[PDB]
Specification:
By secondary structure, this protein is an all-alpha fold. 91% of the residues lie in helices and 0% in strands. The chain has 2 helices and no strands. 3% of the residues are buried. Residues 4-71 form a coiled coil.
Length: 74
């Protein structure tokens, strides 16, 4: 079993990235909270953007492994 192992590793990879990018989001939030300047606010935007996207792609990968499992089964 190549195939299934590698979709899993890629879910692993993205969850690790999500761990870190959520943290950076908390950092951008704290910073905007304390000083709402325009640079702070665009950093906050970008981090929100990266977390939403990783989360979107993780859903995709998980969906795709479930189908790959179901296809092997059938």
């Amino acid at each position: 079993m190549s195939t299934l192992k590698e979709v899993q590793d890629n879910i692993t990879l993205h969850e690790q990235r999500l761990v870190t990018t959520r943290q950076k989001l908390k950092d951008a939030e704290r910073a905007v909270e304390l000083d709402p300047d325009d640079v702070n606010k665009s950093t906050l935007q970008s981090r929100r953007a990266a977390v939403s996207a990783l989360e979107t792609k993780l859903g995709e990968l998980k969906r795709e492994l479930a189908d790959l499992i179901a296809a092997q089964k059938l």
